[PDB]
């Protein structure tokens, strides 16, 4: 509480410093947003097979976008960039991470132990060991404390919408983690209860529902088109009781903004 206001102020400060270049995929000659979307979706499965935290998944995607913002990569090596990042995210956030042999196994021997270890070192060199990155996940939990009594269906749903945004670089790279986390919570709350972005959260973040509107329009479209999307590992993860089967909930037709 004493430091709670300070942490949000610091993360808001850090999320700008840790932001990747928005149009990095344009200056990337052999890889595209589809490859990135396929990669991020695959890491969602990896997380579930190894029961990793949703923060581990959020950190990996940040590291990936940052590595790809400064490094040219061919499609053949894109999965090695993703494996080393997931391994690094797991080492940073998991109590104990899965061993390297297991990471080499979930790639079906596409790469070697040496390759994974060498890429880990390269990712760390390229990211200059700056691994404590603010995520949508991080801003969502700080926001949830402004919901007393709490609705775990709203929390699960915001977690899901927050995660959907990791798949599609276009348009979510143009939004900061705090802004997606705002849109996700409003859209989650509005879908379950009908209530909107609270005044306590307006005062905390300095974000009006109007300032969230560009992100929220995109997050609403993504939600409506989610059963139609090519990537479905997130919808499968959230139809489970763990997250109160929130992906099975029907999105609203209109937001009325």
């Amino acid at each position: 509480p004493d430091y709670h206001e300070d942490i949000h102020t610091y993360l808001r400060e850090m999320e700008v410093k840790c932001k990747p270049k928005v149009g990095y995929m344009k200056k990337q000659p052999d890889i595209t947003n589809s490859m990135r979307a396929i990669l991020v979706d695959w890491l969602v499965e990896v997380g579930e097979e190894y029961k990793l935290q949703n923060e581990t998944l959020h950190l990996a995607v940040n590291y990936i976008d940052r590595f790809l913002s400064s490094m040219s990569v061919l499609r053949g090596k894109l999965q090695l960039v993703g494996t080393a990042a997931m391994l690094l995210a797991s080492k940073f956030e998991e109590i104990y991470p899965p061993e390297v042999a297991e990471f080499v196994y979930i790639t079906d021997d596409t790469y070697t132990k040496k390759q994974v270890l060498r890429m880990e070192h390269l990712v760390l060199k390229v990211l200059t060991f700056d691994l404590a990155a603010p995520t949508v996940n991080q801003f969502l939990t700080q926001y949830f404390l402004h919901q007393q009594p709490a609705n775990c269906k709203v929390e699960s749903l915001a977690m899901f919408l927050g995660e959907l945004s990791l798949i599609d670089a276009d348009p979510y790279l143009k939004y900061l983690p705090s802004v997606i986390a705002g849109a996700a919570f409003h859209l989650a709350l509005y879908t379950v209860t009908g209530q909107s972005w609270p005044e306590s959260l307006i005062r905390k973040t300095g974000y009006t529902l109007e300032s969230l509107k560009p992100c929220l329009m995109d997050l609403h479209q993504t939600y409506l088109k989610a059963p139609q999307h090519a990537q479905q590992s997130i919808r499968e993860k959230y139809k489970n009781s763990k997250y109160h089967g929130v992906s099975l909930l029907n999105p609203p037709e209109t937001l009325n903004l």
Partner: protein, 298 residues
Amino acid sequence: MENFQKVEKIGEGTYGVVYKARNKLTGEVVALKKIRLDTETEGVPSTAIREISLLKELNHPNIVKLLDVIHTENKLYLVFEFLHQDLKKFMDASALTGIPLPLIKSYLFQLLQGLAFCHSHRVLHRDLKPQNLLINTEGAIKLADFGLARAFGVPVRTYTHEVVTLWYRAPEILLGCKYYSTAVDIWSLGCIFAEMVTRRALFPGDSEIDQLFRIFRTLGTPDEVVWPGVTSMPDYKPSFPKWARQDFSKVVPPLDEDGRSLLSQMLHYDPNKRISAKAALAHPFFQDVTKPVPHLRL
């Protein structure tokens, strides 16, 4: 790495070996943490990753400065500023004489100042102990070894193999709470504050049960009134002896009304009611705080 001359080994551990070194070109005296990776079949240890990320974000005069990271195919080296000794060696030298209160006050104020920065930057230390606290001849104290340190942007879950040595472990950890909080770090410093005063470890337990019982014998056995939810904790037992709280005149005899007040709030059973680093820094105890120089025996 070619520019460093190893001078002396100044500590060991699982984390890596710490040395005293000299930069041959600038003359700068540094501390070097050697981390052997040819040995490490699993890559860069999670501790080295957690310590480098977090420390290189934590710039404060009461937090050790990380000057460089020499990352090679063979080994990993962390280059840090040098400080003359740890609080454990200083405490042992002062076991006969005693650390004068103005120096205890300076030291705890600075520890709390570094910790407040840690906490306001979403970082838990989780291993505060005298040897992890470094002092210098100019009068400063700084927090070191961020090996078990974690970013708490999302709550940090508890792990058995990555906790502080018993002696400075919080009762919540010992009773099996599912999560860490800033309060674990405050308890640790409270123990360290009483150790500086009484010239001995406040809770020197040989086991988790011996650790609890030593806490219970001093602060009284906690109950649902003192600590709501304590009887619902995994490692809690209703069969625990029910001791009464000892008077702080017996626990910390050479401590004043304010000193006794601040320590009682630092050693509160309930982590939600335990004083924060921010709050303690505003305590009347530090109204007259000065920066004295210690008596070092190098």
